Amino acid sequence: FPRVKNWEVGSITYDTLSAQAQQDGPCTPRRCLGSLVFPRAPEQLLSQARDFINQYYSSIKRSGSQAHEQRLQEVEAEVAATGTYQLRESELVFGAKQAWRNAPRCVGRIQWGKLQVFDARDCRSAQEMFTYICNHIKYATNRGNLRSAITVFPQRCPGRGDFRIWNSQLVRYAGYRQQDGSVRGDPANVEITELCIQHGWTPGNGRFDVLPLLLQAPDEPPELFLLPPELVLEVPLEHPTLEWFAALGLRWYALPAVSNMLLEIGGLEFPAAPFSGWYMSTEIGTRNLCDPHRYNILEDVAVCMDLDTRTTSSLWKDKAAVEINVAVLHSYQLAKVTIVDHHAATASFMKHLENEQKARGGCPADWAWIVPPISGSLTPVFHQEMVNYFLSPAFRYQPDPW
Amino acid sequence: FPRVKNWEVGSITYDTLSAQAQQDGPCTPRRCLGSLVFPRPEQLLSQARDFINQYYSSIKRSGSQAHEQRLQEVEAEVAATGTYQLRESELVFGAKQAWRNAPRCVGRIQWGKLQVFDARDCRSAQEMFTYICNHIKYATNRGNLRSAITVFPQRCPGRGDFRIWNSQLVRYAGYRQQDGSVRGDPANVEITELCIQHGWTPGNGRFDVLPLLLQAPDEPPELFLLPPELVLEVPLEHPTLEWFAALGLRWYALPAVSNMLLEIGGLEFPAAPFSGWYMSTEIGTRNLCDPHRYNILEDVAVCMDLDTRTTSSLWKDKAAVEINVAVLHSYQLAKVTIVDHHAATASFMKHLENEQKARGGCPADWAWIVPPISGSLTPVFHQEMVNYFLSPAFRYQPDPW
Numbered sequence: 001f002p003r004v005k006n007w008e009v010g011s012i013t014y015d016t017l018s019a020q021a022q023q024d025g026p027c028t029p030r031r032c033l034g035s036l037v038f039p040r041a042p043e044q045l046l047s048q049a050r051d052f053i054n055q056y057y058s059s060i061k062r063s064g065s066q067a068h069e070q071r072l073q074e075v076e077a078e079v080a081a082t083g084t085y086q087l088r089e090s091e092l093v094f095g096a097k098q099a100w101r102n103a104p105r106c107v108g109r110i111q112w113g114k115l116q117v118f119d120a121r122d123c124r125s126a127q128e129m130f131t132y133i134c135n136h137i138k139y140a141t142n143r144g145n146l147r148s149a150i151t152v153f154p155q156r157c158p159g160r161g162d163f164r165i166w167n168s169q170l171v172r173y174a175g176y177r178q179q180d181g182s183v184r185g186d187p188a189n190v191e192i193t194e195l196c197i198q199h200g201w202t203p204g205n206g207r208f209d210v211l212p213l214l215l216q217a218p219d220e221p222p223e224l225f226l227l228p229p230e231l232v233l234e235v236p237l238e239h240p241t242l243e244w245f246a247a248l249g250l251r252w253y254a255l256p257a258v259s260n261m262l263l264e265i266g267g268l269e270f271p272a273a274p275f276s277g278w279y280m281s282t283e284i285g286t287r288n289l290c291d292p293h294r295y296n297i298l299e300d301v302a303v304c305m306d307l308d309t310r311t312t313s314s315l316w317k318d319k320a321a322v323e324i325n326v327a328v329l330h331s332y333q334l335a336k337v338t339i340v341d342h343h344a345a346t347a348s349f350m351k352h353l354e355n356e357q358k359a360r361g362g363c364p365a366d367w368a369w370i371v372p373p374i375s376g377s378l379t380p381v382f383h384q385e386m387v388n389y390f391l392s393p394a395f396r397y398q399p400d401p402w
Numbered sequence: 403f404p405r406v407k408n409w410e411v412g413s414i415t416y417d418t419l420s421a422q423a424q425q426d427g428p429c430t431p432r433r434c435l436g437s438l439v440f441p442r443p444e445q446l447l448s449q450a451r452d453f454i455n456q457y458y459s460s461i462k463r464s465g466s467q468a469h470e471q472r473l474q475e476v477e478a479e480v481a482a483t484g485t486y487q488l489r490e491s492e493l494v495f496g497a498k499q500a501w502r503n504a505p506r507c508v509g510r511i512q513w514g515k516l517q518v519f520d521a522r523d524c525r526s527a528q529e530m531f532t533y534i535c536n537h538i539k540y541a542t543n544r545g546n547l548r549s550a551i552t553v554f555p556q557r558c559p560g561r562g563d564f565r566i567w568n569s570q571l572v573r574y575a576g577y578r579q580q581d582g583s584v585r586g587d588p589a590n591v592e593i594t595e596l597c598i599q600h601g602w603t604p605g606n607g608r609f610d611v612l613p614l615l616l617q618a619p620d621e622p623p624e625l626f627l628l629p630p631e632l633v634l635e636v637p638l639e640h641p642t643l644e645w646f647a648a649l650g651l652r653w654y655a656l657p658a659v660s661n662m663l664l665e666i667g668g669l670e671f672p673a674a675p676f677s678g679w680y681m682s683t684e685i686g687t688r689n690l691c692d693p694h695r696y697n698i699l700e701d702v703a704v705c706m707d708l709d710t711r712t713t714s715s716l717w718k719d720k721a722a723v724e725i726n727v728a729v730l731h732s733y734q735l736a737k738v739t740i741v742d743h744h745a746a747t748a749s750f751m752k753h754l755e756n757e758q759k760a761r762g763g764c765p766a767d768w769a770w771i772v773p774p775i776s777g778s779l780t781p782v783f784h785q786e787m788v789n790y791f792l793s794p795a796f797r798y799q800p801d802p803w
């Protein structure tokens with residue numbers, strides 16, 4: 001079992017939980033590929049099902065009881081009879097929480113037990129799908145006191161196509177290829193913008209235009225649905241002492257809601273199961289606004305700050321990024337929208353690792369995604385060695401449906 | 403062949419060089435251990451043969467006379483003596499390759515410019531000290547630093563090793579108290595009490611340069627006191643925060659690692675110090691601000707009158723940036739070579755491109771190439787990397803006590 005050191009304190013633990021990792025990752029003893037963003041039959045369905053059922057019955061202090069073996073035989077009979085099986089409602093709640101608990105690139109997992117699970121497995125159409133989604137956004141936003149939630153749409157099954165949300169998040173800003181070479185709005189979203197237009201959306205031409213939703217019912221082309229503006233809570237960005245910062249016209253939205261990942265529970269697959277929490281400020285301040293391939297505002301802010309941008313050693317990039325993050329935090333706090341800074345988030349992740357060490361003997365964590373993109377070694381996770389592996393239930397990436 | 407993408411630009415390459423990985427890393431399909439710092443008879447000919455072909459292809463002299471010739475003498479030298487000796491040029495070439503192959507080094511754009519001091523006829527701790535002193539004075543060069551490595555004799559059976567007990571050639575002391583805690587550098591508490599054990603009269607300050615403990619084969623170590631005028635140091639001030647000078651902070655000019663083992667063509671040099679110049683985050687961010695190092699972050703923030711009562715004021719981030727500003731400013735004012743993390747990472751991206759065309763890839767350790775402040779503001783953050791182990795190499799090694 002791997003030995004893990006914390007270099008700030010001197011602590012040493014052993015991740016015995018990793019030895020239970022079932023699915024494989026991209027590394028070998030030849031070469032480590034940890035830094036890559038996207039690394040990647042009835043009896044095999046059965047073995048995954050059996051394991052998750054074991055997991056659930058372990059969690060309810062009923063391992064090896066009547067009910068436990070009853071459910072095991074029940075599932076196999078249903079796989080033999082139908083090729084698949086159905087989760088009970090409590091099993092679904094537990095599986096959705098474990099999937100979050102198990103996600104190695106999430107720093108906010110101290111919250112994994114507090115998750116509101118909406119069961120939309122009866123969903124019938126794209127129109128019902130949209131109504132479920134609007135209710136999700138409304139509950140999670142909660143006027144700025146954000147609540148963690150996931151809505152689970154019907155599972156993959158033989159004979160019918162998948163439900164899919166084509167959008168990568170429920171809230172995204174348009175990216176319009178410009179007259180010259182530039183992009184207006186969010187360059188990360190040029191493709192989905194083009195698909196929405198191709199599917200009859202009338203584009204805008206601002207930098208923060210909220211995209212419509214493309215929703216796919218089984219064996220249907222996607223359908224366009226506009227989000228009511230009063231559903232999408234946004235935060236204008238201002239800076240507590242740089243009064244010109246407001247004149248940049250920057251905004252960001254309250255709700256981070258990932259909508260293109262696949263939820264896996266006991267071999268069953270839910271290709272449509274959007275989940276949401278609340279932001280950590282560096283995702284907005286550092287990545288979304290300062291990435292050269294995103295809004296790329298860093299130089300314009302530094303010039304406005306009167307910094308000397310002709311030489312790297314003045315650290316003008318670092319200084320302007322810090323104030324952009326201050327602005328994000330101040331603005332969300334002013335608007336009373338939940339937000340966590342990278343210092344508080346990494347410190348609560350440290351409690352999560354200690355909680356998880358006692359509970360399960362380890363915790364899967366992807367160091368490069370856990371450590372914030374600014375001020376890395378100022379946070380305690382920097383000095384924590386970590387073991388990255390795949391547990392199930394899980395949220396996995398999947399191909400775009402176009 | 404691993405697909406490698408740059409997410410800033412969208413470019414793709416393939417790492418065909420990863421195929422040659424001699425030693426195996428710590429990762430398995432089951433789990434990744436990339437974030438761990440240190441992981442937990444005639445087959446000398448295989449590694450020697452392979453290194454010789456490496457030398458001769460590099461000089462465009464594969465499959466010719468001198469190449470054929472040199473393959474035989476290494477064959478006969480081992481047959482007679484059980485080991486072999488490197489030609490001076492090969493020792494040079496193998497030292498530059500080990501640097502070139504170091505996955506955690508972001509300064510490798512410089513790998514071709516390395517001064518190799520051959521101390522292989524060393525015979526006592528006294529000779530060591532004079533070698534190490536020539537190196538230090540040459541590498542320091544009055545603040546215009548020059549990369550350098552001194553190579554002491556190769557290990558051989560039945561006889562002890564040459565070992566430098568200090569982790570670097572310049573280290574500040576770390577002193578315990580009537581209450582346990584540390585004055586000076588906490589990273590050096592162990593060697594500090596080793597030096598005191600072997601007779602060094604300890605100082606009282608937070609920046610006392612330690613004495614050297616040099617160890618010739620089969621004789622216990624011997625204290626050596628560096629000439630104070632040979633240890634170039636930079637007092638730390640800030641361009642606009644006039645009180646910063648008063649904090650009394652300093653750092654030394656020469657980063658010179660003296661505890662790693664150099665392996666070339668199957669030969670092992672447990673004592674082979676190498677030196678370059680600092681990247682400024684090493685001093686300003688890790689050495690001065692790590693909680694287990696000098697841990698000065700709150701003291702600077704108090705002096706800047708920052709709100710240390712809430713983490714969301716980002717007072718830690720602001721104080722850290724100014725500490726790095728003070729490091730860069732002080733080193734440049736003193737005309738001592740230093741490079742900031744933006745310049746350094748941008749040169750590394752050029753290194754990657756050079757290495758792609760020349761060797762088909764480059765072993766890089768993402769967690770160590772990305773700087774410890776402002777990570778995603780540098781281009782290496784957005785570059786996928788592949789980590790693997792090529793020879794010649796620098797490796798870590800046990801402590802000689």
Ligand code: HEM
Pocket residue numbers: 096099100103105106107108109111115148149150258275276277278279280283340345369395
């Ligand atoms: C409640 C507060 C939460 C915080 C502060 C938080 C924070 C984060 C951050 C900073 C990342 C890295 C994302 C990036 O850099 O792009 C991440 C990734 C992730 N989070 Fe969390 N998260 C929260 C809630 C949730 C919830 C409720 C779920 C699922 C039920 C979840 C599942 C995931 C997954 C699957 C990823 C990796 C997906 C990806 O971005 O590639 N998170 N989280």
Ligand code: HEM
Pocket residue numbers: 497501504506507508509510512516549550551659676677678679680681684741746770796
């Ligand atoms: C010339 C300017 C150089 C710069 C700016 C530089 C910079 C760095 C930095 C920032 C690290 C990260 C280590 C840490 O964060 O603790 C590193 C590691 C390393 N460097 Fe370089 N370096 C230089 C020259 C050299 C030379 C000349 C050699 C050997 C001949 C070398 C060999 C290594 C090795 C083996 C490591 C990883 C092992 C370790 O120290 O932990 N470097 N370097």
Ligand SMILES: Cc1cc(N)nc(CCCN2CCN(C)CC2)c1
Pocket residue numbers: 256257258275276277278279280283
């Ligand atoms: C639920 C949740 C909360 C949070 N605070 N953050 C996230 C991640 C945002 C998605 N990321 C965007 C960039 N990248 C393409 C990977 C996907 C999710």
Ligand SMILES: Cc1cc(N)nc(CCCN2CCN(C)CC2)c1
Pocket residue numbers: 657658659676677678679680681684
């Ligand atoms: C040659 C060189 C140049 C440079 N600029 N930096 C270094 C790294 C200094 C040692 N570090 C900190 C201690 N750590 C255990 C080993 C790595 C080396």
Ligand SMILES: C[C@H](O)[C@H](O)[C@H]1CNc2nc(N)[nH]c(=O)c2N1
Pocket residue numbers: 035036037368369370409783784785786787
């Ligand atoms: C190439 C590199 O792995 C990539 O840019 C990663 C690095 N770490 C990250 N970490 C987080 N949290 N989010 C990211 O998007 C990334 N991107």
Ligand SMILES: C[C@H](O)[C@H](O)[C@H]1CNc2nc(N)[nH]c(=O)c2N1
Pocket residue numbers: 007382383384385386436437438439769770771
């Ligand atoms: C735990 C973690 O792997 C460890 O602190 C590493 C991370 N990255 C690093 N990167 C550099 N350059 N130097 C270091 O000492 C470390 N430490």
Ligand SMILES: [Cl-]
Pocket residue numbers: 256283288
């Ligand atoms: Cl986002």
Ligand SMILES: [Cl-]
Pocket residue numbers: 657684689
């Ligand atoms: Cl150092």
Ligand SMILES: [Gd]
Pocket residue numbers: 241242243
């Ligand atoms: Gd102002």
Ligand SMILES: [Gd]
Pocket residue numbers: none
């Ligand atoms: Gd004052």
Ligand SMILES: [Zn+2]
Pocket residue numbers: 027031032033034429433434435436
């Ligand atoms: Zn790995």
